[PDB]
């Protein structure tokens, strides 16, 4: 509390991120930052004001950018909400997002209870 040590956040939270990365096929669109021109979705940043992806979250854990664990939870949820905002409900990314949210819910609960 209330600025947690970065090494403690990394040790506690990284397994929850790893759980997301282990999901195949579902994590694949989330593993790298979105590049709208290269992917042919040029309106992406117009709609998605705060992009987020698994590699960025990992980098933030690795580099001590979270002061407290709810900031990490908020970035994971930002990633999910961006995908549900941008994509149509029939798309792979939308359905994959929903699966990741299921996995994350299960993983994050006991970890947050342990951190305070
Ligand atoms: C597009 O669905 C898939 C599904 C599986 C795979 C791939 C792509 N690919 C491509 C992965 C790169 N393309 C995207 O990442 C992406 C593309 C269009 C829309 C969106 C994209 N992602 C962002 C997060 C979004 O919200 N909409 C690899 C094989 C597995």
From Swiss-Prot:
It is found in: Cytoplasm; Nucleus. Transmembrane segments: none annotated. It comes from the Eukaryota. Residues 43-89 are annotated as: Interaction with histone. Residues 4-111 form the Bromo domain. Coiled coil: none annotated. Residues 81-99 are annotated as: Interaction with ASF1A. Methylation of the KIX domain by CARM1 blocks association with CREB. This results in the blockade of CREB signaling, and in activation of apoptotic response. Sumoylation negatively regulates transcriptional activity via the recruitment of DAAX. Acetylates histones, giving a specific tag for transcriptional activation. Mediates acetylation of histone H3 at 'Lys-18' and 'Lys-27' (H3K18ac and H3K27ac, respectively). Also acetylates non-histone proteins, like DDX21, FBL, IRF2, MAFG, NCOA3, POLR1E/PAF53 and FOXO1. Binds specifically to phosphorylated CREB and enhances its transcriptional activity toward cAMP-responsive genes. Acts as a coactivator of ALX1. Acts as a circadian transcriptional coactivator which enhances the activity of the circadian transcriptional activators: NPAS2-BMAL1 and CLOCK-BMAL1 heterodimers. It is linked to Chromosomal aberrations involving CREBBP may be a cause of acute myeloid leukemias. Translocation t(8;16)(p11;p13) with KAT6A; translocation t(11;16)(q23;p13.3) with KMT2A/MLL1; translocation t(10;16)(q22;p13) with KAT6B. KAT6A-CREBBP may induce leukemia by inhibiting RUNX1-mediated transcription. Found in a complex containing NCOA2; NCOA3; IKKA; IKKB and IKBKG. Probably part of a complex with HIF1A and EP300. Interacts with GATA1; the interaction results in acetylation and enhancement of transcriptional activity of GATA1. Interacts with MAF and ZCCHC12. Interacts with DAXX; the interaction is dependent on CBP sumoylation and results in suppression of the transcriptional activity via recruitment of HDAC2 to DAXX. Interacts with phosphorylated CREB1. Interacts with CITED4 (C-terminal region). Interacts (via the TAZ-type 1 domain) with HIF1A. This is CREB-binding protein. It comes from Homo sapiens.
